[PDB]
Design a protein that fits this description.
Length: about 290
């Protein structure tokens, strides 16, 4: 294909396997084989087009897309290559990341998200595994925009489970709206995880996920979430929980850090801080 050789499996993304490869310039790339919704139904032309426009996303914290290779029921995406990801790093660490590093990862993640959100490009699947990191501690987000083009599939058991951990309450309760707020919730979860060394809400199912959330942040109500009642899977019979003190589940974060984090994990999507507002927070000036 396109003259690439030396493939080498290097992981398994949410849409297929990822390989490290080289072209005929010696230069390295990451090749993602897209395994999609209906594989036997071919790849619609609108999909090809939607993906190819993602080539305009050019920013220091977004994994660059170089080429879209479409061959007889075989879609391959050629991406910038990075040798490490945040999940792998969190896995080996005990107690999380040092504050200075957490901050730098947080800053760079926000910058990437902000650049995309300004162009109406959503992720809808942010998680540690999609945050790629190079030698120099630079962070690049992978997979922005693929959910819109490919749709979000129900992944292999072990993957769907990890995915729940970063899913906003409104989404778990049946919302299907287009929103930038979905990504900000994921950042909050990622933020908490860098400080604690473990996922903040590790549920095993949607329902379990929602309860783990409410058990820590409080159950929704008229004051904290007007119109939550409009969500399809909302239930007024939710066992009531009062919110826990931020300090109790955020290991000596820091004052400004807790505040910023509290703005990300607002249950009401409409009150959730944006990426660009987050970048203005005193946390990053300290």
């Amino acid at each position: 294909m396109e003259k690439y050789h030396g493939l080498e499996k290097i992981g398994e993304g949410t849409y297929g396997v990822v390989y490290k490869a080289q072209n005929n310039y010696g230069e390295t790339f990451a090749l993602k084989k897209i395994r999609l919704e209906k594989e036997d139904e071919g790849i619609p032309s609108t999909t090809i087009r939607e993906i190819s426009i993602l080539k305009e996303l050019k920013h220091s914290n977004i994994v660059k897309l170089y080429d879209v290779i479409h061959t007889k029921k075989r879609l391959v995406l050629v991406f910038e290559h990075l040798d490490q990801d945040l999940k792998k790093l969190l896995d080996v660490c005990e107690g999380g990341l040092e504050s200075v590093t957490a901050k730098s990862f947080l800053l760079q993640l926000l910058n990437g998200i902000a650049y995309c959100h300004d162009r109406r490009v959503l992720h809808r699947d942010l998680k540690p595994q999609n945050l790629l990191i190079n030698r120099e501690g630079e962070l690049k987000i992978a997979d922005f925009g693929l959910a819109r083009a490919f749709g979000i599939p129900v992944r292999k058991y072990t993957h769907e489970v990890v995915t729940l951990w970063y899913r906003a309450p409104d989404v778990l309760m049946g919302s299907k709206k287009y929103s930038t707020t979905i990504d900000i919730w994921s950042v909050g979860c990622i933020f908490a995880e860098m400080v604690n060394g473990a996922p903040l809400f590790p549920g095993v199912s949607e329902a379990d996920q929602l309860m783990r959330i409410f058990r820590i942040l409080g159950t929704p109500n008229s004051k904290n979430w007007p119109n939550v009642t409009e969500l399809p899977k909302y239930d007024p019979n939710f066992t009531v929980y009062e919110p826990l003190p931020w300090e109790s589940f955020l290991k000596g974060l820091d004052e400004s850090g807790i505040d910023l984090l509290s703005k990300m994990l607002k249950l009401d999507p409409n009150q959730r801080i944006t990426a660009k507002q987050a970048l203005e927070h005193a946390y990053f000036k300290e």
